[PDB]
């Protein structure tokens, strides 16, 4: 590794301080007094103190007046060699960012007359814009420094179309990079594209959603979802497969855009759509990855497009996809990754604002949380903003219904507050939730937007791992086993889910309002459930394996709180017993819709499962109040839960309801809690026909649930 010459080192640490390395075999050349320069400035500076390092001697120095950025500065030293003074971790001060937040907007600013480009590079001295286009003539524009650290130039003539890239210097050397706010990018995202208001027209206006509690998330992945080979779409593993209206397999089953309407899911939660890396756009085929590689995010991922060396092309595509499933009354929403970045060294912030975007730990090195390589510095202020403006983008730009944060945990509850507000107003309904993991990333505990601190984070949801381990069993223990794969043991947790996790007796509240618990017991991470009981049950039949994870569905889907379905999880979907299957081929991640055909009527049970459920309010309360005044356990043993929702008068269409979830093959008979005439509406073998009228007792034969209602 090559490197610009220099006598000696010095850096900002901070904004009156500067540190002066020399090395060893120069510390009686190289001293003291120091002295700081710039054109038209040479002053002195004070030694605070001084210390040997293992190749090197340190001298902490102060200056009387702060440190100006923008300009090269000098540090002589008393033997007349000079330096350049770099950037040292100024720029991950308190002072510094109120000194440089900017409020205004960065990017190429587009008008058929001219473009503005702006970046913010506070710590540089120097930046410039390169522009070139296919069969044209590149130009290279130095920028002007303006206030807040921000650089900027104005192009005159219509750059649409024109490739981009920002040229930053700092610390005497300069790194090309794209636009942080490129809205467009090249084949690959190799470099930023300025393209003009594309014009799209959104003609399927929809209300703002109601309330939490009354969706249900269907978690896909755009390749997985429809490059099976009999998927019965077109566009296979592309943005448009989406839009296609009435595809059925090629036994007849409704396939794609036709099947998730079908299925009754109000949300379609996407895998990251945003510009990601490990799959070649110019070989698609060749790998396969799930998208957690962020590169630009504010650009679309090229992959999925019919065209990616066409910038507008994949715009166009996703947009369309987006317009035609509210065209269709389905909502989107967007898997976002703010948690951080592609190889954090060679990423857009890193070259632009060195040390800044992300987390060190008290020996400068940084930190680890999300456990790939960085942590994004959500907690910077012009990290906070980038967030923001990112999110309010994708709402405006793209009209998207809401946002499932990857890692939330990771993020720091005023930036999360923040976002939300600015979300929110843009968009009143949009759903926000996300994994609030608690992990080593180097923020105090409370400013951790964590499950813990859910409290804090009102109108934030968050995945209730409790009920999802309860239901299945725990997932870091591939054997173990949860209620639906007969463990006794976690029936109380399980019917605490079922109630909101918002408190149940000694169990204490999982999270405030059940409109912030994201119940589920599958996603794309870990085994499926399918495949984790395969390894829980090793000998149970294919029959009974079903009934259970049917069962599973039947706990969430009835559960107070946010339904959430993993996409294929309807029918049994398996990913061949891998774990991980963030970059495994199309065999193993695509969605089967050879499965779905074979078991239409194990789907079809979800199906009715969601019809019940938007047809009966009593399923979802709105409150943890209403809920103690609605719902009560009226038997909990090891493989039977039974409960009820009562005094629904101007509540639910049926008086009162009954539900028993049954985990052992075997019969047993159950006493109702009086003596009233029900209906029996479902049972293990599924929902009945015409629900035949049962008293005082019912059978309970096998793995299943069994439902009585009482009309008016
Ligand atoms: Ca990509």
Not at 134 to 139: E, H, L
Not at 496 to 514: D, N
Not at 656 to 665: G, K
Request: proline share 5%.
């Amino acid at each position: 590794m090559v490197s610009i010459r220099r006598s000696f080192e010095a850096y900002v640490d901070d904004m009156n301080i500067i540190t002066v390395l020399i090395p060893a075999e120069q510390k009686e050349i190289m001293t003291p007094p120091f002295r700081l320069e710039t054109e038209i400035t040479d002053f002195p500076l004070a030694v605070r103190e001084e210390y040997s390092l293992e190749a090197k001697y340190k001298y902490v120095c102060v200056s009387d007046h702060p440190v100006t950025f923008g300009k090269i500065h000098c540090v002589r030293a008393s033997s007349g060699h000079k330096t350049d003074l770099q950037i040292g971790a100024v720029i991950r001060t308190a002072a510094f960012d109120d000194e440089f937040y900017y409020d205004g907007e960065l990017g190429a600013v587009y008008t058929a007359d001219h473009t503005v480009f702006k970046v913010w590079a506070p710590a540089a001295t120097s930046a410039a814009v390169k522009l070139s286009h296919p069969n044209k003539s590149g130009r290279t524009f130095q920028m002007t420094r303006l206030e807040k650290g921000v650089y900027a130039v104005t192009v005159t003539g219509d750059l649409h179309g024109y490739e981009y890239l920002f040229c930053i210097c700092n610390n005497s050397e300069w790194m090309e990079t794209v636009d942080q706010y490129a809205k467009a990018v090249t084949v690959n995202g190799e470099k930023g594209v300025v393209l003009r208001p594309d014009q799209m027209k959104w003609t399927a206006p929809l209300k703002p959603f109601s309330h939490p509690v009354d969706a249900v998330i269907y978690e896909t992945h755009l390749r997985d979802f429809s490059i099976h080979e009999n998927s019965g779409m077109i566009n296979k593993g592309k943005y448009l497969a989406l839009t296609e209206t009435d595809t059925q397999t090629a036994n007849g089953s409704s396939s794609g855009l036709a099947y998730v309407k079908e299925l009754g899911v109000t949300h379609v939660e996407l895998l990251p759509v945003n510009d990601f890396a490990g799959v070649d756009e110019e070989k698609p085929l060749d790998a396969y990855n799930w998208g957690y590689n962020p590169l630009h995010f504010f650009a679309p991922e090229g992959s999925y497009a019919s065209n990616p060396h066409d910038p507008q092309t994949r715009k166009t595509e996703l947009k369309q996809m987006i317009n035609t499933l509210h065209q269709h009354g389905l909502r989107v929403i967007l898997d976002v990754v703010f948690n951080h970045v592609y190889k954090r060294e060679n990423s857009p912030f890193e070259k632009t604002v060195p040390g800044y975007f992300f987390r060190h730990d008290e020996c400068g090195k940084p930190s680890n949380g999300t456990g790939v390589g960085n942590d994004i510095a959500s907690e910077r202020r012009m990290a906070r903003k980038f967030i923001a403006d990112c999110v309010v983008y994708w709402l405006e730009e793209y009209n998207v219904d809401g946002f499932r944060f990857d890692l939330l945990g990771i993020l720091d509850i005023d930036t999360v507050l923040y976002m939300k507000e600015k979300a929110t107003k843009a968009k009143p309904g949009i759903l926000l939730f996300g994994e609030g993991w608690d992990l080593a990333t180097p923020l105090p505990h409370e400013q951790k937007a964590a499950l813990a601190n859910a409290p804090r984070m009102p109108g934030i949801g968050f995945f209730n791992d409790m009920f999802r381990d309860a239901v299945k069993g725990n997932t870091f223990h591939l054997k173990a086993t949860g209620f639906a794969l007969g463990n006794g043991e976690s029936a109380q947790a399980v019917m605490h889910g079922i109630a909101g996790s918002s408190g149940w007796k000694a169990l204490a509240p999982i999270v405030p309002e059940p409109s912030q618990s994201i119940n589920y017991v599958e996603s794309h991470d870990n085994h499926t459930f399918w495949d984790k009981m395969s390894f829980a049950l090793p000998q149970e039949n294919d029959s009974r394996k079903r009934s259970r994870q049917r069962l599973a569905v039947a706990i969430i889907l009835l559960a107070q709180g946010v339904p959430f379905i993993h996409s294929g999880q309807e029918f049994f979907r398996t990913k061949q017993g891998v774990e991980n299957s963030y970059q495994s081929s199309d065999s193993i991640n695509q969605l089967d819709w050879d499965r779905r055909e074979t078991f239409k009527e194990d789907v079809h049970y979800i199906r009715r499962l969601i019809s019940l459920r938007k047809a009966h309010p009593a399923f979802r309360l709105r409150s943890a109040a209403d809920i103690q005044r609605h719902l009560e356990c009226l038997t909990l043993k090891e493989h039977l839960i039974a409960y009820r929702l009562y005094d629904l008068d101007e509540v639910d269409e049926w008086k009162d309801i009954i539900v028993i979830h049954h985990a052992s093959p075997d019969s047993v008979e159950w006493r109702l809690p009086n003596d009233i005439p029900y209906r029996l509406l479902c049972d293990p073998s599924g929902f009945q026909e015409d629900p035949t009228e049962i008293k005082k007792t019912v059978a309970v034969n096998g793995i299943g649930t069994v439902i009585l209602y009482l009309a008016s």
